[PDB]
Amino acid sequence: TGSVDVLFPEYDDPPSEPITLLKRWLATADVARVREPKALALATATSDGRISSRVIAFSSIDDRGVIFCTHSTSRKGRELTETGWASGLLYWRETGQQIMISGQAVPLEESENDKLWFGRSVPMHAMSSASHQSDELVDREALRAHAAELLALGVALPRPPRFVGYRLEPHEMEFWAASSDRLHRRLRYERDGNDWKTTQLQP
């Protein structure tokens, strides 16, 4: 299909919960053959307010938010511990859609972290265990050699404590869909206690 004028009937009649709409949009993105729809630009900040960002491919979406895995000792992991707030942005060129998810990243339980680790491959385990994500790389060949050593053992590799999941639980979401006449469709959800309030925005 085209990158303007996607159908968006929910603009005028929004579901009560934004996660419902998020899942709908993601499912349509798959029908539309969007390339890497789950590539989320995740922004976090340090205590002085300085913002950093990187792509995360999220794992799944449950009824409460967007689940992803990372190293708790990485830059994003340290920032999340410091300040809690995060924002994630999806953008699909093929359909002219963006989704902003702003919330807090809630650490998952250890049992959930284990299940996430078990869902990955042994090569992923080996590089994840060998690398302290975002720390200075001193010796690239040594790192590569250690990941190869771990793989060759053929033993189950334990989950390093830094490998953890978070749930990004939104307090605000925006759904944006391009229009060819430039009056883009913008639907904002904001938490309102146990409910949500929606607004349409000017482009």
Ligand X SMILES: Cc1cc2nc3c(=O)[nH]c(=O)nc-3n(C[C@H](O)[C@H](O)[C@H](O)COP(=O)(O)O)c2cc1C
Ligand Y SMILES: O=C(O)[C@@H]1CC=CC2=Nc3ccccc3N[C@H]21
Q: Which of residues 80-139 bind ligand X (CB under 6 A)?
A: 98, 133-134
DSSP H or E stretch at residue 190? strand 185-192
Q: Is the dihedral of CA 120, 60, 46, 91 positive or negative?
A: positive
Least distance in Å: CB of 201 to ligand X? 7
List gaps in the chain by the residue before each (C–N > 2.5 Å).
none
Which entry of ligand X, its own copies, ligand Y, none binds 76, CB below 5 to 8 A by partner kind?
ligand X
Would you count residue 187 as binding ligand Y (CB under 6 A)?
no
Token pair belonging to 87: 């924002």
Closer CB to its own copies, residue 93 or residue 109?
93
Would you count residue 128 as binding ligand Y (CB under 6 A)?
yes
| One residue of 40, 42, 45, 69 binding ligand Y per CB under 6 A | 69
| One residue of 6, 40, 44, 70 binding ligand Y per CB under 6 A | 70
CA separation for the pair 80, 100 (Å, rounded) = 18
DSSP H or E stretch at residue 31? helix 18-31
CA separation for the pair 194, 135 (Å, rounded) = 40
Taking residue 86's Cβ as centre, other Cβ atoms within 10 Å add up to: 25
In the annotated binding site for FMN, the residues are 54-57, 69-70, 75-76, 98, 133-134, 186
Interacting residue ranges for ligand X, rule: CB under 6 A: 36, 39, 52, 54-57, 68-71, 74-76, 98, 133-134, 176
In the annotated binding site, the residues are 54-57, 69-71, 75-76, 98, 120, 128, 133-134, 186
